[PDB]
Each structure stands twice: as C-alpha cells, then as structure tokens.
Design a binder for this molecule. Structure first.
Ligand code: HEM
Ligand code: HEM
Ligand SMILES: Nc1ccc2ccc(CCNCCCc3cccc(F)c3)cc2n1
Ligand SMILES: Nc1ccc2ccc(CCNCCCc3cccc(F)c3)cc2n1
Ligand SMILES: C[C@H](O)[C@H](O)[C@H]1CNc2nc(N)[nH]c(=O)c2N1
Ligand SMILES: C[C@H](O)[C@H](O)[C@H]1CNc2nc(N)[nH]c(=O)c2N1
Ligand SMILES: [Cl-]
Ligand SMILES: [Cl-]
Lengths: 362, 362
C-alpha cells in the first residue's frame, strides 16, 4: 500500500507542478522515470525545480496562513545533502542568518533529507529555531509556559537555563542512528531581538518586554508528491498581533495585560471599562512601533488582510480554487474590521502542504 | 409525509419536554391525545406549559447565542388567540412596553398563531420591532443601509420617512387573507433611545450618535415539536459590541470609525497606528457607558463570555450536550481575551430552535 500511496501522490504532484511551470510535455517521461525509481528503490528523488516549487505550493495551500500572497517568492534552500550533526547545525545557523538579513526578513525554507520508510534522517525538537525557555517549579513561573516541556527535556540533556524570562533555548535535534539528541547554544550575534517601547508612553519601557525578530517554525512536516520532509524549517516575518495579542497577552503565555494597563495609566478593575481591550490595542501599537524603529520587518493585521484579499483575487484570476481556515485567518484583534471576517472559506486540505507531526518528547 | 414529520417531531419534543418538567409518566397519554388530534385535524395544539418550555429550549439550543445562561428565565407571552390586525398591533406594542420595563429589560417572547399547512396566519415584515430606516438614492446615503429594502417596501405602502439618520420604521405585517401588509407608526413614548457619549471625551457628543434600547428580533421562526411559529418576536438586552463594533462601525452600516478617530483626536492615516482598533475600543466604551448612565440594561463581551462559560458548566452538570457556533460566539473585539476563542464547539442543530425564513418582500 505504501508504494501505491506514493505513486499516486507523485502522479498528482508532477502533473500539477509541471503544468504550472509550463513543462507539461515532460510529464510522461518524468513519471516513467519516477515509476521505475519507486519500483527499484522504494522511493524517488525530486529535482531542484520540483522541490522548490513544491515548497511554494505547500505555502500556497496552507489554509491557516494569512500571508500567502507572497508564496511565489519563497527562498528555498536545498540541504538534502547533509549527513552530520555539525552540518545540520551549520545549516540551521545559516538559515537564521540569511532569513534575518539584518532585519529585512527573507521568507526562507531549508529542506533536509526526507523520511525513508517512516524513518527520520534528522529530527528537530525545537518548535521554533528561536524561542524562549519556560519554567514552572513550586508555583514559580518564569519565561514562556508554552516552552515548559521542551525546556525540561533540554535540562535532562546537560543544558541549564539562566532562568530569566527570556532565555534563548539551544537548538536541539537528533540524527538517524543516535539515541539522544544533541544541543547547541545559539550564537547571540545571530539573534535579533526587539525591545518593546511605546510611541507616546515613556513608562512602557518599565515593562522591559522584548521579543525575537524572526519566527522560524521548525517542527512541521513538508509533504511534496508523496515525499515526507519532516525536517524543513521555514519563516516569514511576524504579524504584530501574533506577538502583542497572543504571545505577550495570553494568560497561558506571558500574561502582561494587567501590567500594560498599569503603565498606560488605566484601572483594571471593571469589565465595562474594556481595559483589556484598550491594553491590547496599546501593546499591539507598541509592538509595531518597536519593530519598525528597530528596522525589523513586521506587518499589521489590516495590511496583512488587504494582502490576503489580493491573494484571493490572484487565486480566482489564475483559475485556482481557494482554501482557508476562517477560524485562523481572522486576526485576534478587530477581526470584524477586515474583509476576512465577512466571508466564508472552504477548509479542504490540498497537497503539497505543511502538517503537524508528533513530538519526539513528552 | 407532512403528518409523519409532524408526529415524529412531536414524539421527540413531548418526551424531552415532559422529562425535563418531571412529568415523564404523562407522556403516553399526551402522545395518544396528540396522535388522534393529528389524524383528525392535521395538527395539534400545545399546552401552555409545552409552549413556554419549548420556547425556552429553543433559546437554549441557539448555537449562535452567547447569552444562553438565562434561557430558563425567558418571559413567554401566549398570543395564539389573536385574529385581528388591531390585536397583533396592540400585542406588538405591549411586547415593546413590557420588555423595555423602563430600562430594566426583561427577555420576552410573544407567540402568535402558527402556520397551518405552510399557511401563515400572521406575517411580520420587520427584522426588528424597533429599527432605523435606510435610504440610498443617487449616491446619497442616509440612515441604516441594512434597512434599505424594507424602507423602500414601506414607502410603497403610503408611508414616508423623514430621512434623518435615525428614522424609526413603522411596524409592518400582513394578516392571513389580506393581499398587502398594514403599517403603524411606533408611539415615541414606548421607544427608549440612548444618546452615545464618552466618559472622558466631551467632544464625543459632536457625533450625535444614538441607538435604541431593546433589540426585538421579529423575523425568525420558532419551531416546537413540529409546530411552526413563524411569528414570534423575542428580545434580550444588547451586548455592547453589537452596537459599537458592528451597527455603528461596519462600512456597510453606519461606518463611523473615521469620525470617531477624529473626535478622540487620533490620525486615521496609517494602518500601523492601529487607529481603527483604538477607535473601536473608545466607541465600545462609550456605548457601555451611555447605556449604564441611561439606566438601560446592557452587557460587555467579557461578562457575557463568563456567563456563557457558566452556561457550559451548567449544561455538562445537567448531562446535556452543548452545541454552539464558534464563528458567531466569539465577540468581534478582543476575541482571544475570552475563553470561547480557545475552545471548540459542536455546531449540530437541535430542536426546538429558532430558524431563518424567507422574507416576504425583495
Ligand atoms: C511572510 C510573512 C508571513 C506572515 C505575516 C504569516 C502570517 C501567518 C500567521 C499570522 C499565521 C497564524 C499563526 C498563529 O496564530 O499561530 C500563519 C500560519 C501559518 N503560516 Fe504563515 N505567514 C507568513 C509566511 C509563511 C511562510 C513563509 C510559510 C511557509 C513557507 C507559512 C506557513 C504558515 C503555516 C503552515 C501556518 C499554519 C501553522 C499551523 O497550523 O499551526 N507562512 N501565518
Ligand atoms: C438576554 C440577553 C441576550 C444577549 C446578550 C444575547 C446575545 C446574543 C448575541 C450578541 C448574538 C449575536 C448577534 C449578531 O451577531 O447578530 C446572539 C444571537 C442570537 N441570540 Fe441571543 N442574546 C440574548 C438573549 C436572547 C434571547 C432572549 C433569545 C431568544 C429567546 C436569543 C436568541 C438568539 C438567536 C436565535 C441568535 C442567533 C440569530 C441568528 O442566527 O441570526 N437570544 N445573542
Ligand atoms: N508570521 C508567521 C509566519 C509563519 C508561521 C507559521 C506557523 C505559525 C504557527 C505558530 N504557532 C502554531 C502552534 C501550533 C499548535 C497547535 C495546537 C497546539 C499547540 F500546542 C501548538 C505561525 C507563523 N507566523
Ligand atoms: N442581544 C441580542 C439578543 C438576541 C438576539 C437575537 C438575534 C440576533 C441576530 C441579529 N442579526 C441577525 C442577522 C441575520 C442575518 C443573517 C444573514 C444575512 C442577513 F442579512 C441577516 C441578535 C440578538 N442580539
Ligand atoms: C462568514 C462568517 O460566518 C460571517 O461573516 C459571520 C462571522 N461571525 C459573526 N458573528 C456574529 N456575532 N455576527 C455576525 O454577523 C457574524 N458574521
Ligand atoms: C478552537 C479554536 O480553533 C482555537 O482556539 C484557535 C482559534 N483560532 C486561532 N487562530 C490563530 N491565528 N491562532 C490560534 O492559535 C487559534 N486558535
Ligand atoms: Cl510565535
Ligand atoms: Cl442589532
């Protein structure tokens, strides 16, 4: 059944891919080559072109992503050649550097060798390449709660966090054949962070908030034409609400709204005062302001939604069906102020695509 | 097939209803009585108890409603006895008075005679008993755009609006047998309106905004045990976001955010300033403030969500399955600040319930 599933996904992918790339007549020969390779090796190897385009289609198909207008400009790095843990490390280090691009973020994906027969060649443990540790001990809560289990897993491996609220986690990943993952501290020179300040309210600095510049999601599986690239970190730039409305605002994350209300000088006593709403708005304004001031790419939810509307228009005029997840596309602040809120989306899954996969710890 | 559909809905309703009311042993006899009545008349008549409880269950089952905690305290008025257009008018007038209750709003439903064989006895044309007219002529836009087609329909019937932005529409409904609906101007003494002012910003009055006190939805069908009550207006009190975030804020409604930004003294030039978000928050604070100050019942979205959480807890501990529409339950401002955003809901349709029905005009 395995080979059959593979062959079928391969037929659909190559057809679609070669048609978009204006290479329709090359399908028959390529598919034959593929058919033999599968019969003879149990799998097949993508050309540079297939891989690059498949990663772009995968982005284009991510129902939950509001930033898809720019799918065709994704920078794809092919690292299917790595074999050593040192090579993986340096490739991950490089990804951070070139994606960050001194603040002018380039949307980038680095692709590692794919699974063979469900056997991972490289297994990344980080949720993001850059993320803060979290600690929960005897009622004492430090840093990012979403990182608690990974942090505890790293502290099994010989690492120890300084237990500030903003400890950078080390890169952690396992190689095929090894029993335990390895870990490498991030070079601080590679990581841009942004201090959160407010355009009008000087006291906002008293909160001593900051966040990292580039979200590099590193735990999802890229699937292209039946080939499972479990290790393929990618990044865009942030939409401000991700930081200001969720990461810093959620009760199960940094939970800062009460502190925000205090520094902006409003009471946090009565629901009818809408103090949480006001606090959210000022925190989100501060995040956008701080990133711009630091010269680090970011988008506000309004601009982002107008871009996504263009993505919609582009999809129709190219004759492609649009898919989306309304519940994730709407932004967590002022959603009714965007067009997204007022239309519906088909949530069907189209491949290529990025998928959740089981965590190697927990 | 009609009688069969009816009988089946009746069996399920009476079973459930009599069980909740601790009257389980009275089911067999009641169902027999019902079975004969259907065979002999083509339909059946609900007892006072069945009707009252069925209207409450219908509210309890409205997936899209965040205010369901108070389903069991619904005030049900039985007007199945009306036969004249004067009687309907006075019943609608009465509903407004007793629901308004001098500002201490009582959630109320008035139930009129149900359809016979799809034949409506009374057919209400208003979306709400109290709502503002809308006009769109030669690029000139006045009042509430959502009311444009009903307003044009009324102005066919001999009525004429003053073309202020806040013209009260007359009640309009048709009686079985009549070809045209009739219309009656609302007595101004019965309608509470609230001027919108802001707690801190005196200039907010310059906008001369106002809204009506009681939303009385009058175009939905109540379905109870196979009986179709097409005419059954009901009301709660407002959640502030309904007014501040949608009615006054939407581009296809009153579209006031640019004006709001101006009076609160912020520029409306750059998306990154989040001026729409700030404007939404101040407008929503003003709406809550104005209603409280006027002594008219209203709830903020936070309190409302905490109440709905209690509804959820109550549903489980009573062994009832919970149903809901996540896309409508989340409030249109700061949705991620409520628990609703972070859980999922089953959107299955359970009867009794309230349903959309086709409009008699357009
Ligand atoms: C260029 C700037 C980009 C922006 C502003 C953007 C924006 C977003 C946002 C706000 C989310 C929701 C995040 C959350 O609520 O947790 C999202 C989801 C997602 N984005 Fe993007 N994105 C961008 C680029 C990319 C790129 C380059 C890829 C991959 C090539 C990608 C793939 C996805 C996927 C797979 C999800 C859903 C993840 C999940 O289900 O957990 N996006 N995007
Ligand atoms: C007591 C105060 C109440 C509050 C605060 C409340 C709140 C809400 C809100 C905010 C909505 C969404 C409105 C929209 O976005 O258009 C809603 C929907 C709804 N509510 Fe309630 N509600 C209340 C009482 C009631 C009552 C008394 C009933 C009927 C007996 C009811 C039945 C419904 C129904 C049927 C909907 C959905 C209508 C549709 O699909 O268009 N609610 N409620
Ligand atoms: N700005 C961007 C760009 C690309 C992105 C790509 C992916 C994401 C998702 C980040 N958070 C995903 C959380 C996944 C998850 C789902 C359920 C439970 C859980 F613990 C974690 C955000 C992005 N933001
Ligand atoms: N505060 C309350 C209480 C009860 C309510 C009961 C119902 C409602 C819904 C009011 N707006 C419904 C709009 C229905 C609709 C749907 C699609 C298209 C359309 F034109 C109209 C609001 C309520 N608000
Ligand atoms: C397509 C989408 O379901 C539609 O825009 C809904 C979204 N959720 C909503 N929620 C509420 N309360 N009211 C609405 O009118 C809508 N509109
Ligand atoms: C149950 C619900 O789908 C869940 O809370 C979702 C809602 N929409 C979301 N949307 C985004 N962008 N991010 C999220 O984490 C979530 N959480
Ligand atoms: Cl993030
Ligand atoms: Cl309304």
């Amino acid at each position: 059944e395995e080979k059959e599933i593979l062959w079928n996904e391969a037929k659909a992918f190559i057809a679609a891919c070669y048609q978009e790339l204006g290479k329709a007549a090359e399908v028959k020969d390529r598919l034959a080559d593929i058919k033999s390779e599968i019969d003879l090796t149990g799998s097949y190897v993508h050309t540079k072109e297939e891989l690059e385009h498949g990663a772009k289609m995968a982005w284009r198909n991510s129902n939950r992503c509001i930033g898809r207008l720019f799918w065709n400009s994704l920078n794809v790095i092919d690292r299917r050649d790595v074999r050593t843990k040192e090579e993986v490390r340096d490739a991950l280090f490089h990804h951070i550097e070139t994606a960050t691009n001194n603040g002018k973020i380039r949307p980038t994906i680095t692709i590692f060798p794919p699974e063979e027969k469900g056997e991972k060649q490289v297994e990344i443990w980080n949720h993001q390449l850059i993320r803060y540790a979290g600690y929960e001990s005897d009622g004492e809560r430090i840093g990012d709660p979403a990182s608690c289990s990974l942090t505890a897993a790293c502290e099994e491996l010989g690492w120890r966090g300084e237990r500030t609220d903003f400890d950078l986690l080390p890169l952690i990943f396992r190689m095929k054949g090894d029993e335990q993952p390895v870990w490498y501290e991030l070079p601080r020179s590679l990581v841009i962070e942004v201090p959160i300040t407010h355009p009008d309210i000087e006291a906002f600095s008293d909160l001593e908030l900051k966040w990292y510049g580039v979200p590099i999601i590193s735990d999802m599986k890229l699937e292209v034409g039946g080939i499972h690239y479990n290790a393929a970190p990618f990044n865009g730039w942030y939409m401000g609400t991700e930081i200001g409305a969720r990461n810093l605002a959620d009760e199960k994350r940094y939970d800062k709204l009460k502190k925000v209300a205090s520094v902006i000088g409003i009471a946090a006593d009565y629901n009818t005062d809408l103090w949480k709403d006001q606090a959210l708005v000022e925190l989100n304004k501060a995040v956008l302001h701080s990133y711009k001031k630091q010269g680090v790419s970011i988008v506000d939810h309004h601009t982002a939604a107008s871009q996504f509307k263009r993505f919609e228009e582009q999809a129709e005029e190219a004759g492609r069906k649009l898919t989306g997840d309304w519940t994730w596309l709407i932004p967590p602040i002022s959603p009714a102020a965007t067009h997204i809120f007022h239309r519906s989306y088909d949530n069907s899954i189209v491949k290529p695509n990025y998928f959740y996969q089981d965590k190697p710890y927990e």
